[PDB]
Amino acid sequence: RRVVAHMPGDIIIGALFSVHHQPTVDKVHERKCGAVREQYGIQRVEAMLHTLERINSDPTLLPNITLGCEIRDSCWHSAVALEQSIEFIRDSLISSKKPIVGVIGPGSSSVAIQVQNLLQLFNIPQIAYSATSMDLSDKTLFKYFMRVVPSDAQQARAMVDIVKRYNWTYVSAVHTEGNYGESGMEAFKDMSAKEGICIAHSYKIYSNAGEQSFDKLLKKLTSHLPKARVVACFCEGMTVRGLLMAMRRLGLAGEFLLLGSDGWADRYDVTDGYQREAVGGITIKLQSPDVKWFDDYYLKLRPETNLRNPWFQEFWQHRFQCRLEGFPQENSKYNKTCNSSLTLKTHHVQDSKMGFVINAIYSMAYGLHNMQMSLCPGYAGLCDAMKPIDGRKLLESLMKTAFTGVSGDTILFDENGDSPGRYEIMNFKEMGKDYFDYINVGSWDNGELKMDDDEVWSKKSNIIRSVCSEPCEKGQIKVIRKGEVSCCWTCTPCKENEYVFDEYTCKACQLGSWPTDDLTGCDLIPVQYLRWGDPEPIAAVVFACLGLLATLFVTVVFIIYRDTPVVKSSSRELCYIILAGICLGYLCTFCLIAKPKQIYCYLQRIGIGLSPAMSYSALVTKTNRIARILACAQLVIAFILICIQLGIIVALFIMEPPDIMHDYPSIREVYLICNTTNLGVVAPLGYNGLLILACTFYAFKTRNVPANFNEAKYIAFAMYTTCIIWLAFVPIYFGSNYKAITMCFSVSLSATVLLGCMFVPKVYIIL
């Protein structure tokens, strides 16, 4: 029964426009709707009527095709829209009074969803101009749905893009609870993980929550205020006003950067009285090019002339509160009559989604045109393959369609039947006096963000990067995981020996290698040289040189005077073995102090093994001779004893072959030593000790022999001193790391005491 605005045509596009207000709870079953909507309603019906006239008058597309329409009141309520959609469907069915080819979707998403659920069963393509819910992106559930508006998912995309632009990490996130805000925050946090942006706490409040509730929410948000300053509300306007109430009450303004979605977009009524409260906030609007087409088509519309629109007349009486008695719709509500002088241009503000409506209409027109060109390239009108027009092929054409819209830019439909995003970023800035207002600060389009950074803050004193992680020191400071968020670093330095393995992971490289200046990596420290002017090495060298000079002098003296009683007092043949042993022992000091080559690794051990063994073998033979007392015999004994230690050295070579060892006293210290282990040093020392104990046993028996001018007494004393020195320096050797120096001093002083205690009396006597 309800009146339908019917424009005649050949291919007939239906539409649902929210002409009347939502009926209250009392008339949900009767379904008597409220007052006529001005901005959302009749503007749109006039829009499509004029648009269809223009398309009818445009030879550019659909040449011999006339497009009619039916406008049915949608009342912004699901029930009424469903009634009207039923009327559409039955008309189309009984047609098979004319079949509806497609339909322009209702405003609200919560209504468009149900209308889609109904239309999906009859292959009726629907195009929406206001449905922005992202649950309509599915094609499993809503196959026949087309949007010239981007979903709220793309609002979330724009917000995350601008946050990325301003380089923030630890931002707070609140959202209105319901269909809108909840899903919006889900999308936002979905697209946050792809950017590494952290979220403080996904707070969730109503628009009807108490002032106390709002204050509690503000306190909860401010709990992390020092760290988190940018609060993204996927918020309704009333939520914004609630938060502003809370901010004025708590007085915690300034740090709270209110980044809002399409809530307080341009709606200053949201923030009237609270201009100072939320200055510097960032919001988003849909791009709405003011279309002059409708301005010209609409401002010249008088009630009498505009006969085609049925309720328009009625609208007049409500628009101006005047009762046009002359007009058939002589409503008794208004007292005064309507003056002919009263025009419509006054207070004329067109809807904020006018571009979208026109875009949807052209979208369907171009869909039909594309399908016509695909299937009817013959007759300029309706071909054979179009007479039973089917929704499947029309939707197929509509998926793969594009054109320049009335707005100015192109309209593309992706896989999910969504137009690309087209947003304007705006800031609630303050003027000179208390006249704060909204100003455009750039645009967001299809992914590319063109913001005007210089416009906001007017300087480089913006809100600090809300982050839980200050940039770590490039030296050794490594990130940690506090377990709270994914961007809360405690830049604790790595170990002195560690390097920067990763940004979040630290490691220390292999032994010997030490990190660089900035711990970029690590490098191997040079090995020790062991030929130095160090006091201890030079002291050893001086001692060895003095010993060599003394040995050479005494050797020469004893070789020349080989018949004197003083020389005859001792073995005039076996002393050469002593001299050779002593000289080799002295040269051992020089052997150790050099570059520790493989050949040197051989020679050093060879010398330090042979020379002491040889010397003490001669000593033990001499002591045995003395014991016999109180010479082609003892030579063989001495040779065998020397060969014993030579065999020991050979066996040690066989067991553990020498190689140039990179000795590591620490990990930050690298020295170069041969592979002489504990066994490799003890074994020669063991044999030397055995010979020394033998000498001690065979000489202690003759501790008090003053023969040859007090010879044996001083020899015994010196040997006791030598034994004491050996037993004292063995632990000093093992309890230190200056191994080469210790061996040098030990052998040098051993030979020195021996030579200086057995030969100095002899030299003094002879000269």
Ligand X SMILES: *[C@@H]1O[C@H](CO)[C@@H](O)[C@H](O)[C@H]1NC(C)=O
Q: With binding defined as CB under 8 A, does residue 255 bind its own copies? A: no
Element (H, E) at 161: helix 152-166
| Contact predicate 74/107, CB 8 Å | yes
Minimum distance between the CB of residue 250 and ligand Z99, rounded to whole angstroms? 25
CB 381 within 8 A of CB 3: no
Closest CA to 66 of 4, 125, 8: 8
Q: How far is the CB of 414 from its own copies (least distance, A)?
A: 26
Which option in its own copies, ligand Z99, ligand X, none does residue 568 bind, with CB closer than 5 to 8 A by kind?
A: none
Min dist CB 389 to its own copies, Å, is 10
d(CA 122, CA 99) in angstroms, rounded, equals 12
Nearer to ligand X, 467 or 740 (CB): 467
- 351 appears as a binding residue in the annotation: no
Q: Is 40 annotated as a binding residue?
A: yes
- Angle 610-612-617 from CA coordinates, rounded to 5°: 90
Taking the CA atoms of 375, 377, 382 and 385 in sequence, report the sign of the dihedral they define: negative
Residue 487 or residue 730: which is nearer to ligand X going by CB?
487
Residues 264-283 that bind its own copies (CB under 8 A): none
User: Segment 2-31, which members bind its own copies (CB under 8 A)?
Assistant: 29-31
CA pair distance 506, 672, nearest whole angstrom: 30
Amino acid letter at 188?
Answer: F
Count of alpha carbons within 13 Å of 539, Cβ hemisphere only?
A: 8
Q: Supply 665's token pair.
A: 């006293």
Strands 492-493 and 513-515: unpaired
Is 130 annotated as belonging to a binding site?
A: yes
**Close Cβ partners of 180 (under 8 Å, ≥ 6 residues apart):** 133, 152, 234, 236
User: Residue 118 touches which of ligand Z99, its own copies, ligand X, none (CB < 5 to 8 A by kind)?
Assistant: its own copies
Other CB atoms within 10 A of residue 351 CB: 21
Contact partner at residue 86 from ligand Z99, ligand X, its own copies, none, CB < 5 to 8 Å by partner kind: its own copies
Report in angstroms how near the CB of residue 82 gets to its own copies at its nearest: 5
**11-17 and 100-104: which strand pairing?**
parallel
C-alpha 640/C-alpha 636 separation (Å) is 6
And the tokens for 34? 């409220």
Nearer to ligand Z99, 16 or 506 (CB): 16
Q: How far is the CB of 376 from its own copies (least distance, A)?
A: 18
Site for its own copies contains 737 (CB under 8 A): no
Using rule CB under 6 A, residue 108 touches ligand Z99: yes
Considering beta carbons, is residue 90 or 597 the nearer one to its own copies?
90
Q: Of the listed pieces 91-99, 169-177, 233-241, 258-266, which binds its own copies according to CB under 8 A?
A: 91-99
Instruction: List the x/- string, 92-121, binding to its own copies by CB under 8 A.
Output: -xx-x-----------------x--xx-xx
Identify the CA nearest to 565 among candidates 351, 417, 711, 459: 711
User: Which H or E element spans position 114?
Assistant: helix 109-119
- Region label for 156, one of left (φ > 0), alpha (ψ between -120 and 50) or beta (otherwise): alpha
Q: Whole-number minimum distance, CB 230 to ligand Z99, in Å?
A: 21
d(CA 140, CA 138) in angstroms, rounded, equals 6
Q: Per CB under 6 A, which of residues 245..264 are in contact with ligand Z99? A: 262-263
Please list every residue from 30 through 49 that binds its own copies, using CB under 8 A: 30-31
Residue numbers at the binding site for ligand X (CB under 6 A): 166-167
Cβ neighbours around 341 below 10 Å, total: 5
180 labeled part of a ligand binding site = yes
Using CB distances below 5 to 8 A depending on partner kind, what does residue 236 bind out of ligand X, its own copies, ligand Z99, none?
Answer: ligand Z99
Which CB sits closer to ligand Z99, 112 or 593?
A: 112
Q: Which is nearer to ligand Z99, 23 or 263 (CB)?
A: 263
What does the block give as tokens for 157?
């995309």
Region 335-394 residues binding its own copies, contact defined as CB under 8 A: 388, 390
480-519 residues in contact with ligand Z99 (CB under 6 A) are none
- Binding mask 119-138 vs ligand Z99 (x if CB under 6 A, - otherwise)? -----------xxxx-----
Binding letters toward ligand Z99, positions 177-216, x by CB under 6 A: --xx------------------------------------
Give CA–CA dist 762/767, Å, rounded.
8
Query: Which residues from 351-390 bind ligand Z99, rule CB under 6 A?
Result: none
Handedness of CA 620, 626, 631, 632 (dihedral sign): negative
Alpha-carbon span 75 to 33, nearest angstrom: 6
DSSP 606: H
Instruction: Cite the annotated binding site for L-glutamate by residue number.
Output: 40, 109, 130-132, 180, 262, 353
Q: Where along the sequence are the contacts to its own copies (CB under 8 A)?
A: 1, 29-31, 82-83, 86-87, 89-90, 93-94, 96, 114, 117-118, 120-122, 388, 390
Q: Where along the sequence are the contacts to ligand Z99 (CB under 6 A)?
A: 107-109, 130-133, 179-180, 236, 262-263
